[PDB]
């Protein structure tokens, strides 16, 4: 059978994972397709309730990684070995058996949402909640799915796919359409002006970035553009769907947000303009009234949320309530808002405050149903009005929204970049990476804005470059480091985006790089013909289970030594042009030191980093043309994700030749065991340098491709 409950134990491929599984916990592997390689898990209770806790069994001596909600809106990571260390509001749990990896996916079932939590006796408890005292139930069959496998990343993907086939309520990341913003540099107004943003400020930011040679091609007009008012520190509520006076042209107040849109696009060459709104309209919802059936609703506290984030009990939203648009009118609300924006030339929305819905289901069939209804309406309106799929999900890390993510393709992966909070930087990097392990199954992770002028700029920028996600700053106008931005952004505003969600390496999945005082975090991604690896020291700070907020904590050393290997890039074989004959040797380029090293298969290279330092490595499979003639493309060596520039690669061993298609401009690098005879770009021989000690070949790609002609055609004759 393979995953099974026997005697009182949960057994996975002949390893006991849980003991003391109680008799009322039921399993099934049946499906309409049919037998499934894991087990759905439920339980039967005596009483109908709107909340149940049930132990699934006892976990001891098994290393785990968990993603848990430290705030309502947002997850972070926790590792451990005992059930007692499993946080409240655990939404994703991965367990290592010492070789076999087991995923636990607590699910939505009917009107109920589940999560996991640990107890003092080391039990892993399943917590099932409808979010509404009127919505009650006494038995469940599919509230948790458990699946095991030998590759931890494949195990997670396979488990998600099985849940999808049972629920049919979401699609996997790879089945969705990415909006076109993810291929361009952008700018977000949020940290530049906060809610004091004006149309002149938007224009000044677009102009200042473009002037330094790194032109953004998308803009997010963040919180502050909307027409909002306090009731007749008081909460603001939405009072109409159009923009406020700061976005009406001063000249003609009848021309609204279309003015800044046309300025952005026609005068400054932007492609996309997005705006922020809350899933409820504004922070205080929408002012009560009959037009969208808005009525006052006050957040209901759930125990697990409040145990981890006690300030939510006295948040302005909790105490002052939200005007909640009616489910009967929610499509009308989004569709009138979004029709107005789209008719003004707006291409998408950043939709924030998403998880509040789970607290507002009391009148209305509970957390799952209300979430599903608002998302169904949001998705219809987005698909109508922003048909490039222009939606970024924000403050949305609840399983109620994840398991109905049928269309939206970009998700903010962590709590906000905080330019003024020194504790936040190392935390942010760990959180984006670990959360991306689970969130990247549903949507492309967005690792958030950052500042190009800031002590942690390079640390943040480097992580964005390897994230696979949208790349955007929130710089105040005129506060730019263009030397840093040139490592991210080409002269036409395009970026070198990697192909996958950036995630921790296999090595790092079970070792906490914020708390263990011993390990570096390694983040891997893939391009088409190289891998990429980012190494970070993020020790010294993390969410505290006793203070219930992010704090600094003590470290034994400042500096830590770890190591890298080619195969740390988990999917590196996929970059090889001949994976069946490849021996696993890679060329490894350090983009900060500018050093090229050949690393044989399995050979480790030491890396030492102090807290808040990082290093980026481009990792390229070596091709052996003939004895003594070996090559690997590196890419745009003065960019962080250098290998993202290589769009085609063919070896012609019979002519001793390499044929490449390369996007961008700047210095191009490659590994060759021999000095090339000639390097040719677009039919003309060009000069080049060769370091015979390292094998590094280097030449300049002078300008971006002429036309249109999207790539430089390069021939390296060995
Ligand atoms: O609004 C635009 C913003 O929306 C998303 O982020 C929202 C943000 O909300 C919560 O933090 C709000 C706020 O808290 C801190 O600010 C103060 C400082 O004491 O605390 C008050 C609110 O409680 C606030 O008035 C104070 O100024 C913080 O320093 C500040 O940055 C925050 O904005 C929530 O805790 C947080 O996790 C976030 O979700 C979106 O993610 C942003 O990109 C942006 O669009």
- Tell which residue, 371, 483, 354, 446, has the closest CA to residue 113: 371
- Tell which residue, 41, 52, 35, has the closest CA to residue 17: 41
Find the 418 Cα to ligand 1 centroid distance in Å.
9
Residues 342, 344, 345, 347: is their CA dihedral positive or negative? negative
Those residues with Cβ within 8 angstroms of residue 158's Cβ, 6 or more apart along the chain or in another chain: 37, 147, 149
DSSP E strands in 291-347: the ranges are 295-297, 322-324
**Which atom of ligand 1 lies at the shortest distance from residue 417's CA?**
43
Cα 61 to chain centroid distance, Å, stands at 30
Residue with tokens 């648009």: 325
Containing domain of residue 396, as a range?
A: 175-487
Find the 389 Cα to ligand 1 centroid distance in Å.
26
**Which atom of ligand 1 lies at the shortest distance from residue 412's CA?**
41
Report DSSP state, residue 252.
Answer: -
Find the 472 Cα to ligand 1 centroid distance in Å.
19
Q: Phi/psi of residue 607, each to 5°? A: -140, 130
Mutate to test the pocket of ligand 1, among 278, 305, 416, 431 (most ligand atoms within 8 A of CB): 416
Structure tokens at 706: 């002429």
Residue with tokens 């991604």: 525
Q: Is 685 left (phi over 0), alpha (psi -120 to 50) or beta?
A: beta
Q: Phi/psi of residue 622, each to 5°? A: -75, 135
Angle in degrees, CA 126, 128, 129, rounded to 5: 150
Find the 397 Cα to ligand 1 centroid distance in Å.
16
Residue 291, judged by CB atoms within 10 A of its CB (0-12, 13-18, 19+), counts as middle
Q: Is 214 left (phi over 0), alpha (psi -120 to 50) or beta?
A: beta
Report DSSP state, residue 572.
Answer: G
Those residues with Cβ within 8 angstroms of residue 336's Cβ, 6 or more apart along the chain or in another chain: 241
- Kindly give the pairing relationship between strand 348-352 and strand 272-278: parallel
HEC sequence for 104-161: EEECEECCEEEEEEECCCCEEEEEEECCCCCCCEEEEEEEEEEEEECCHHHHHHHHHH
**Which atom of ligand 1 lies at the shortest distance from residue 220's CA?**
45
Cα 496 to chain centroid distance, Å, stands at 17
**What dihedral angle (degrees, nearest 10) is formed by the CA atoms of 463, 465, 469, 475?**
80
Using alpha carbons only, how large is the chain's radius of gyration in Å?
A: 26
Residue 486, judged by CB atoms within 10 A of its CB (0-12, 13-18, 19+), counts as middle
Residue 454 belongs to domain with CATH number = 3.20.20.70
CB 578 within 8 A of CB 649: no
Find the 574 Cα to ligand 1 centroid distance in Å.
41
Structure tokens at 385: 């009005």
Find the 560 Cα to ligand 1 centroid distance in Å.
33
**Which atom of ligand 1 lies at the shortest distance from residue 448's CA?**
43
Q: Which residues line ligand 1 (CB under 6 A)?
A: 71, 73-74, 190, 222-223, 276, 352, 394-395, 415-416
Q: What is each CA distance from 616 to 493, 609, 643, in whole angstroms?
A: 22, 12, 12
Find the 266 Cα to ligand 1 centroid distance in Å.
33
CB 103 within 8 A of CB 146: yes
Prior bond of 283 cis (ω within 30°) = no
Residue with tokens 């790609």: 701
Structure tokens at 69: 């909600």
Q: What count of other Cβ atoms lies within 10 Å of the Cβ of residue 211? A: 13
Q: From CA 542, how far away is CA 549, in angstroms rounded?
A: 8
Residue with tokens 């070996």: 630
Buried b (16+ CB within 10 A) or exposed e, 583-616: ebbbbbbbbeeeebbbbeeebeeebebebbbbbb
Nearest-CA residue for atom 29 of ligand 1: 418
Nearest-CA residue for atom 42 of ligand 1: 416
- Tell which residue, 500, 473, 499, has the closest CA to residue 487: 473
Q: How was this structure determined?
A: X-ray
């Amino acid at each position: 059978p393979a995953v099974r409950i026997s005697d009182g134990n949960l057994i996975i491929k002949n390893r006991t994972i849980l003991t003391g599984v109680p008799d009322n916990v039921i399993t099934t592997s049946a499906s309409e397709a049919g037998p499934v390689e894991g087990v759905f898990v439920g339980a039967v209770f005596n009483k109908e309730e709107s909340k149940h806790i049930v132990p699934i069994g006892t976990l001891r001596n098994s290393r785990f990684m968990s993603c848990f909600r430290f705030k309502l809106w947002w997850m972070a990571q926790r590792m451990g070995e005992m059930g007692r260390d499993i946080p409240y509001e655990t939404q994703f749990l991965l367990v290592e058996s010492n070789k076999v990896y087991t995923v636990f996916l607590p699910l939505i079932e009917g009107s109920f949402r589940s999560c996991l939590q640990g107890n003092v006796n080391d039990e892993v408890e399943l917590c099932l909640e409808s979010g509404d005292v009127d919505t009650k139930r006494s038995s469940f069959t599919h509230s948790l799915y458990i699946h095991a496998g030998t590759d931890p990343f494949q195990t997670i993907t396979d488990a998600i796919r099985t849940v999808k086939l049972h629920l049919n309520s979401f699609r996997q990341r790879h089945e969705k359409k990415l909006p076109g913003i993810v291929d361009y540099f952008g700018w977000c107004t949020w940290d530049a002006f906060y809610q004091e943003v004006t149309q002149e400020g938007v224009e000044a930011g677009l102009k200042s970035l473009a002037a330094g040679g790194t032109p953004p091609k998308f803009v997010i007009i963040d919180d502050g553009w909307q027409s909002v008012e306090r009731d007749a520190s008081p909460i603001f509520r939405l009072t109409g769907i159009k923009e406020n006076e700061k976005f009406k042209k001063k000249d003609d107040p009848n021309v609204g947000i279309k003015n800044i849109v046309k300025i952005a696009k026609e005068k400054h060459g932007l492609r996309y303009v997005y705006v922020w709104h809350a899933i409820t309209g504004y922070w205080g919802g929408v002012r009560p009234g009959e037009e969208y059936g808005s009525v006052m609703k006050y957040p209901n506290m759930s125990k697990g949320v409040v145990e981890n984030d006690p300030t939510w009990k006295t948040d302005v939203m909790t105490l002052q309530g939200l005007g909640l648009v009616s489910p009967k009118k929610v499509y009308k609300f989004y569709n009138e808002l979004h029709s107005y924006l789209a008719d003004a030339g707006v291409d998408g929305v950043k939709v924030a405050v998403q998880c509040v819905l789970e607290t507002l289901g009391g009148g209305l069939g509970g957390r799952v149903e209300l979430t599903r209804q608002f998302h169904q309406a949001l998705d219809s309106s987005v698909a109508k009005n922003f048909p490039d799929n222009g939606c970024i999900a924000c403050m949305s890390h609840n399983t109620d929204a994840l398991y109905c993510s049928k269309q939206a393709a970009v998700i903010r992966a962590s709590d906000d970049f905080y330019p003024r909070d020194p504790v936040s930087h190392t935390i942010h990097i760990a959180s984006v990476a670990y959360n991306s392990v689970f969130l990247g199954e549903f949507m492309q992770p967005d690792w958030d804005m950052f500042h190009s002028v800031h002590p942690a700029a390079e640390y943040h920028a480097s992580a964005r470059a390897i994230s696979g996600g949208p790349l955007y700053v929130s710089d105040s106008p005129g506060k730019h480091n263009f030397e840093l931005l040139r490592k991210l952004v080409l002269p036409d505003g395009s970026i070198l985006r990697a192909r996958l969600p950036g995630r921790p390496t296999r090595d790092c999945l079970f070792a906490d790089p914020a708390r263990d005082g011993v390990s570096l975090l390694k983040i891997w991604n893939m391009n088409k013909y190289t891998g990429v690896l980012g190494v970070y020291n993020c020790q010294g700070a993390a969410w505290s289970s006793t203070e219930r907020k992010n704090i600094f904590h003590q470290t034994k050393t400042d500096s830590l030594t770890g190591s890298i290997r080619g195969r740390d890039v988990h999917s590196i074989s996929e970059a090889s042009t001949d994976p069946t004959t490849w021996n696993g040797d890679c060329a490894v380029y350090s983009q900060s030191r500018g050093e090229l090293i050949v690393m044989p298969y399995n050979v480790s290279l030491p890396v030492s980093l102090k807290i808040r330092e990082h290093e980026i490595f481009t990792v390229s499979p070596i091709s052996h043309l003939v004895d003594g003639v070996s090559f690997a493309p590196i890419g745009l060596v003065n960019m962080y994700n250098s290998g993202g520039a290589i769009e085609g690669l063919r070896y012609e061993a019979e002519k001793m030749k390499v044929v490449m298609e390369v996007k961008g401009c700047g210095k191009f690098g490659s590994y060759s065991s021999v000095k090339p005879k000639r390097c040719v770009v677009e039919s003309n021989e060009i000069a080049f340098e060769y370091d015979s000690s390292s094998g590094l070949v280097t030449f300049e790609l002078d300008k971006m491709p002429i036309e249109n002609k999207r790539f430089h055609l390069i021939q390296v004759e060995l």
